[PDB]
Amino acid sequence: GAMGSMERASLIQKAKLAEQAERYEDMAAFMKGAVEKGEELSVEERNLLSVAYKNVVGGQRAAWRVLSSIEQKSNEEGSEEKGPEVREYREKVETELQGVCDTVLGLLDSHLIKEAGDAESRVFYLKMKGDYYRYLAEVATGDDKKRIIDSARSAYQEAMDISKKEMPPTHPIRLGLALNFSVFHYEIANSPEEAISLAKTTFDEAMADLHTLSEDSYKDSTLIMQLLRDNLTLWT
């Protein structure tokens, strides 16, 4: 419950309908119900899961940044006191965003990561684990900040180690993992040199392996490769 009474296949079908309707909160609830059925997810199902939560948390993060910016302006010299409401509402959005991250991290810990044995599933879920700890780190300001950052780092690092051993350098999940771990280094871990090195090396190793790919795979790999290029252009 509340998805316990719905067939697994019906939850998957409805997640795809919610995706078409851009109803990402519904999509995430349906996929959470699907995961809670206890069976491993297919590649298509894992992508539905990740898209749903990525969109939900993406909207919450964008809102949090708008509110945090307002809050920061309210704390500058010569700004008029407007009371507690900006902080209260930023905290409200923050707590909801934390709850979504804890929900995703809970699904990963119960029991997606432990049953994931193939590299494509294990790396995918460990990348999600890094991403949702990273989103927690974006809003962390207290005594658990370093531990949250560590947790993101640890998840991404295990995903990187598996992906380098078991996946081609052009694999979209390997490329996406590297893209996000590089963003983690640049924006969360105060390590822009490591972010740039990772994005460079990733892009270059992928370029050298493109020759092995069919026309469809080439298009898939080159798309994430352009995101790496976009960040290199921004950061250098």
Binding site: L179, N180, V183, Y186, L227, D230, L234, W235
Partner: peptide, 6 residues
């Protein structure tokens, strides 16, 4: 303007 993630 915003760095990319995926």
């Amino acid at each position: 303007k915003r760095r990319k993630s995926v």
